Amino acid sequence: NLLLTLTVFGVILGAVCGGLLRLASPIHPDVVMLIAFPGDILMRMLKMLILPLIISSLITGLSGLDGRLGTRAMVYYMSTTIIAAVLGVILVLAIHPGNPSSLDAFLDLIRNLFPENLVQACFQQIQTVTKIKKGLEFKDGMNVLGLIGFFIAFGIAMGKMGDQAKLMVDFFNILNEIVMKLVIMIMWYSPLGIACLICGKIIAIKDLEVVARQLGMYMVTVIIGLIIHGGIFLPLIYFVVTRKNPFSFFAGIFQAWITALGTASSAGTLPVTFRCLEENLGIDKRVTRFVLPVGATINMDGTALYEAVAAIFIAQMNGVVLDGGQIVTVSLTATLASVGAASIPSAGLVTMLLILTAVGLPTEDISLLVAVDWLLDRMRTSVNVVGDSFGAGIVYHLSKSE
Amino acid sequence: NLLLTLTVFGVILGAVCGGLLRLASPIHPDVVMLIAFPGDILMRMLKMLILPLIISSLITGLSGLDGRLGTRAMVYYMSTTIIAAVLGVILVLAIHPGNPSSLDAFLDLIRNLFPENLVQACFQQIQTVTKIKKGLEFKDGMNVLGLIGFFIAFGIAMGKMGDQAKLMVDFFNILNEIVMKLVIMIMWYSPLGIACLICGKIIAIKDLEVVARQLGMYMVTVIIGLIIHGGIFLPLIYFVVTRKNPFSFFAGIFQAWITALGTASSAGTLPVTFRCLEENLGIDKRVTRFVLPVGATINMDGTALYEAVAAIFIAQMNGVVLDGGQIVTVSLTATLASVGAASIPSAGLVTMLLILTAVGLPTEDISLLVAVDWLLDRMRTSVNVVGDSFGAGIVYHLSKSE
Amino acid sequence: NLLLTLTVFGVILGAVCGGLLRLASPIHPDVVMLIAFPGDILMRMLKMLILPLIISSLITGLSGLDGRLGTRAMVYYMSTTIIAAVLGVILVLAIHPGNPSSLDAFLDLIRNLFPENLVQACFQQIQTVTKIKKGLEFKDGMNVLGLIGFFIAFGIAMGKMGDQAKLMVDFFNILNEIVMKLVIMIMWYSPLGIACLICGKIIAIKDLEVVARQLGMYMVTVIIGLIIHGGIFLPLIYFVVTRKNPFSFFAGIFQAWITALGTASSAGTLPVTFRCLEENLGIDKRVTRFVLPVGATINMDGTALYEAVAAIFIAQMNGVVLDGGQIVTVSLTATLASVGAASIPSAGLVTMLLILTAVGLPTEDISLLVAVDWLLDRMRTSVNVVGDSFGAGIVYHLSKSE
Ligand SMILES: COCC(CCO[C@H]1CC[C@@]2(C)C(=CC[C@H]3[C@@H]4C[C@@H]5O[C@]6(CC[C@@H](C)CO6)[C@@H](C)[C@@H]5[C@@]4(C)CC[C@@H]32)C1)COC
Ligand SMILES: COCC(CCO[C@H]1CC[C@@]2(C)C(=CC[C@H]3[C@@H]4C[C@@H]5O[C@]6(CC[C@@H](C)CO6)[C@@H](C)[C@@H]5[C@@]4(C)CC[C@@H]32)C1)COC
Ligand SMILES: COCC(CCO[C@H]1CC[C@@]2(C)C(=CC[C@H]3[C@@H]4C[C@@H]5O[C@]6(CC[C@@H](C)CO6)[C@@H](C)[C@@H]5[C@@]4(C)CC[C@@H]32)C1)COC
Ligand SMILES: CC(C)CCC[C@@H](C)[C@H]1CC[C@H]2[C@@H]3CC=C4C[C@@H](O)CC[C@]4(C)[C@H]3CC[C@]12C
Ligand SMILES: CC(C)CCC[C@@H](C)[C@H]1CC[C@H]2[C@@H]3CC=C4C[C@@H](O)CC[C@]4(C)[C@H]3CC[C@]12C
Ligand SMILES: CC(C)CCC[C@@H](C)[C@H]1CC[C@H]2[C@@H]3CC=C4C[C@@H](O)CC[C@]4(C)[C@H]3CC[C@]12C
Ligand SMILES: N[C@@H](CC(=O)Nc1ccc(Oc2cc(F)c(F)cc2Br)cc1)C(=O)O
Ligand SMILES: N[C@@H](CC(=O)Nc1ccc(Oc2cc(F)c(F)cc2Br)cc1)C(=O)O
Ligand SMILES: N[C@@H](CC(=O)Nc1ccc(Oc2cc(F)c(F)cc2Br)cc1)C(=O)O
């Protein structure tokens, strides 16, 4: 993509400009603030779209776009995505690629799933505080999970209204279409905004090597998880359900997996993977035709794991320990954000800010992730496809009732 | 109703489980927090629906569903309901069944009726503070009266637009339908959530007998008010307008009043009370046919008085003295909440939380009211019907212009 | 207008009642609070409409009502209006008719143009704070510019959807129609509310003469700016673009300029000014017919300058120095508020409260401006027309491509 080319030029232009300035001389903090500042505007403009995206997206999906295969598929996609998100979380916490009550954390999480007030859910979340007399208190930070939960119920209830709700469905489609023209417009300013964030990050850092390590270990963590998720869990889950040889199964899809690494798009890989399951594995076109193109938008195991790893890496870098509820929010938002980084065009960065905002994390560090994203995007696209493929397998085998 | 059977099983299951635990041994506060916790989820899920109910409900009612008899009826219903709400307030403050600046309180109330900002009205209300230099300051708590006032004006203005506003009417019907499917879904979780609140209330209390007294005196206060409201004020207002014998009037409707106590529903009592006024009193079918079925949704004198008593009883129990504005908010929200506990199905508990939230009261004590509600519901249903009946009377007499 | 007659009776009735009380004896502060109080209700009821007006207005305008002449006109109107707003600001700060970090002020402004959160933009704005460790912190005050920017993008994006967005256009027309029936209803209570504000202002003031001076100097500042804007800048911009004799140009429109001063309405002046440019200047009906009636709603150079002067005069009176960003907010809100004081009927006062709220200024001083507004309204209506007229000129000359 031009935007993909522009964003990487952008990273370079900003990396080089960042060193030139860093090696040039100490940059007065008000001059770094300014070099960064257009990049802060980019984060502000994306964060501004999170709320209207969540509401538009949820309502349009759960109503507008709602058999046995369907449940089989949907149950598969969601299970695998949460597995990848949790694996992400487990792995990032174990390897810990970053260097700078428990019950309450869980009850605050459950509390925040049911916000007393929707406008207040939009910009504030509940917390427990110790006075040893405990109290609930508000804290700044959009209650994302609470809002999502409300809008899932809202959105399912609207489906259960059928055409009686068609005017409300239509209203929220238009809102989605608009809000998506804006996430596209803003993403055109993204290369310059990324440039400025990076340029501003290099100049601030005390020791490039510490950050090169930390970011390197961040890349090893994502590839570990994609390897575990792609190479063990998904095949293992196929064998456990199909009692079939997964090594046989891979043999068929290898054309697709090659295609995924090269294309870095599951949409471009789509016609290849139809062939690989229809011809080589011999999966019934019906089970394919449903599951492959649906899976190419909602199943993104690999994008789930990346987002979970990335979120805690940013947390860890900014010397934040996540409480048990934060780490559960990360798993649930990583899952959803995955589903929507794939469903919403050029929402990759929006969905990262969703995750960071949900856990109340400093957002400017997203710059280093944008920097290494281009290498990782081909590898997670591979795990993303392989998942969809195994699904075709697990659905067809579980669909011999027919 | 199954829900009515389930909620009372729920109260029992929780009362017994509450004693078993209370008599078992001292329960560590973090274990009571947990026993209660599913019940806090119920309050959170209902409070979350208050805002979308008020907006949906107001707009759908004042526009969608808007002669001489009509004004006669509507002026009667509203007057009697405010009388019952104030009687409630007077009675509860006099008998005071609970044991743990004035101008400013009124101006803060009037201020809060006109909120400077609607989003801020949704989660915050104005207050006067003494520094002797007075200031306005925000306080946490949804400005319910302000929001309602805005949405009455909004909703009347939309009616005065006619079909020019039909798309906005339709949009807010669908929203109402949805928001009502959710208040139904949540009310199915209500028995378990009530169980857990009660279970959690018994275990916390130091002296069961003090609370049995206080709750008992709460029941005597409601029956006093239903007696005064049903037995004196309504007949007196009939005689004052009709110069007719009220004791004669009761003679006719006694079949209905019996039916009300047994049925505990004004909807089931409805065909009986048509008969009693058409046949026995000989009220013109026209004046009946309008006033009886409309009154069976919006006239609930007895549900108004109960809600006013209940609100201040919770206030009093939680060692809160209500300022003159709080007590006026209670009368106005008790009035509205009455009208909507009757108009919105399974909204009884929602409408209680509306009243408690409007006055910023601890909500968990709603449990004891849910506990004694089943005895009181047959008695207030009686006063509720008798009111509608007298109305048929007062409208027919005031409608001899014809 | 009756409202115009009533508001001036109102000012008098309140001026006289204010003196009577002021000369009567010292009025206990709680009795002044009360004399003022109905006027505070008026400010509250208008401020409550700002948000739904901005959203309704922006969406209905930028979508519903969106050639070369059109760009020529629109580029002219907007340029001249910002010139008048800045002239307003320059003049009021120089003459300074009122008696009781820089970069950060600009970055806070730019930050506030891109609000991280829309609900939070609705009632809160970002600020820099010094700890010399700088931080961002929220402050109470609706982020008007941020909200407007979001709703311009939103509104343009919806236009670029065409009829695909017709249901969302229709929805936001109805909302506009409603919100405008309310700004009309409230403006009928305005004379009494103005009366009470004034009555309350006289009684509080220590020295009438200081305030008569300050308000007098406020009137000299507006007339200076209308003279500079009307008499120098607009003709100069005509000569610079048309190389034509402006003194000739005025000769034609003098019938209109007379009509403007007398009528105090650009709508009543409208048929006159068609004649003056079609007959005397000989401007092509086409260029007139587009530009004159459009300009009679959106070009209000003179109303822009007044609002800018008025805003800083209120700031200055309330011993507030505006930071560089505040003064830029004033110029941008003064521009917009101009456009909408003209487009929205009886929104003059709403649009003043928009400007004061945008800069977080005490609003009750709007009373003195309402008091002197009647003299100034004929003079700014004159500059308002002259601007539209010169535009017809500058568009026709720049439209000889044809
Ligand atoms: C015959 O075939 C039928 C098939 C059925 C499709 O069903 C839909 C079910 C809901 C689902 C999974 C769909 C699309 C977008 C999905 C959303 C993207 C958003 O992303 C998020 C997170 C990130 C935010 C920035 C935006 O919102 C979520 C809240 C939102 C989301 C995950 C909620 C659920 C949505 C598809 C049709 O498929 C085309
Ligand atoms: C020919 O017959 C005509 C007749 C006319 C009916 O007119 C309507 C007038 C408005 C009215 C009284 C009606 C129904 C719901 C009523 C609402 C319930 C809600 O309850 C509340 C409080 C509690 C909240 C939880 C929800 O909102 C109020 C704000 C809301 C409410 C009290 C606002 C006023 C509404 C009926 C038709 O009758 C079927
Ligand atoms: C063939 O002729 C075509 C012509 C085209 C008209 O185009 C429209 C373009 C948008 C524009 C300029 C129009 C009307 C209201 C204008 C709004 C008034 C509001 O005022 C504000 C500020 C004050 C607030 C209280 C309300 O909102 C702004 C945000 C809002 C505003 C300035 C946004 C822009 C709007 C006209 C038709 O003309 C009839
Ligand atoms: C401050 C901003 C506006 C200037 C930055 C310059 C670069 C990075 C940006 C700004 C706007 C961008 C353009 C906006 C939209 C499109 C349309 C699309 O079909 C192809 C790319 C293209 C043509 C973009 C190319 C890159 C671009 C020129
Ligand atoms: C935690 C929750 C889900 C479990 C609690 C168990 C009990 C109290 C609840 C949970 C869901 C409830 C069911 C949900 C909805 C309906 C449909 C209605 O037509 C009859 C009652 C019925 C069938 C309910 C009976 C009681 C029920 C089984
Ligand atoms: C507290 C308020 C209601 C009382 C104040 C009295 C005066 C100032 C106000 C209140 C309501 C106003 C009326 C409301 C609306 C209209 C309709 C319009 O076509 C002509 C003017 C007219 C008829 C107004 C005249 C002035 C008026 C009588
Ligand atoms: N290619 C896959 C789908 C895929 O990976 N989607 C995706 C794409 C971009 C993206 O953007 C990010 C995320 C960050 F966290 C970050 F810091 C920077 C950027 Br830029 C996030 C997710 C397939 O099609 O299978
Ligand atoms: N039956 C009448 C109408 C009637 O009484 N409606 C009604 C029903 C349930 C209800 O629920 C509550 C309220 C509480 F305050 C509480 F604590 C617990 C519960 Br549960 C409130 C009002 C008729 O039809 O005439
Ligand atoms: N007449 C012009 C248009 C015109 O001036 N519009 C306008 C009208 C009223 C108005 O009202 C205010 C403003 C204040 F700041 C104030 F304090 C009090 C009041 Br009241 C503001 C702007 C034309 O038609 O050309």
Author numbering:
A (entry chain A), B (entry chain A), C (entry chain A): 44 to 109, 114 to 147, 163 to 193, 230 to 500
What does the paper say about this structure?
To clarify the underlying inhibitory mechanism, we determined the cryo-EM structure of HsEAAT2 complexed with WAY213613 at 2.8 Å. The root mean square deviation value with the substrate-free state is 0.399 Å, indicating that the structures are very similar. WAY213613 is composed of two moieties: L-asparagine (LA) and 4-(2-bromo-4,5-difluorophenoxy) phenyl (BDP) moieties. The LA moiety occupies the glutamate-binding site, where it probably competes with the glutamate binding, while the BDP moiety occupies the cavity near this binding site. The mutation analysis demonstrated that the inhibitory effect of WAY213613 is largely diminished when Leu467 is substituted with the corresponding residues of EAAT1 and EAAT3 (isoleucine). Considering the molecular superposition between the IFS-Na+ state of EAAT3 and the IFS-WAY213613 state of EAAT2, the γ2 carbon of isoleucine would narrow the cavity and sterically interfere with the binding of the 2-bromo-4,5-difluorophenoxy group of the BDP moiety. The conformation of the HP2 loop in the IFS-WAY213613 state is very similar to that in the substrate-free state. When the BDP moiety is captured by the cavities, the moiety is likely to sterically interfere with the movements of the HP2b helix, indicating that WAY213613 indirectly prevents the HP2 loop gating of EAATs. In summary, the LA and BDP moieties of WAY213613 play distinct roles in the EAAT2 inhibition, by competing with the glutamate binding and sterically preventing the HP2 loop gating, respectively.
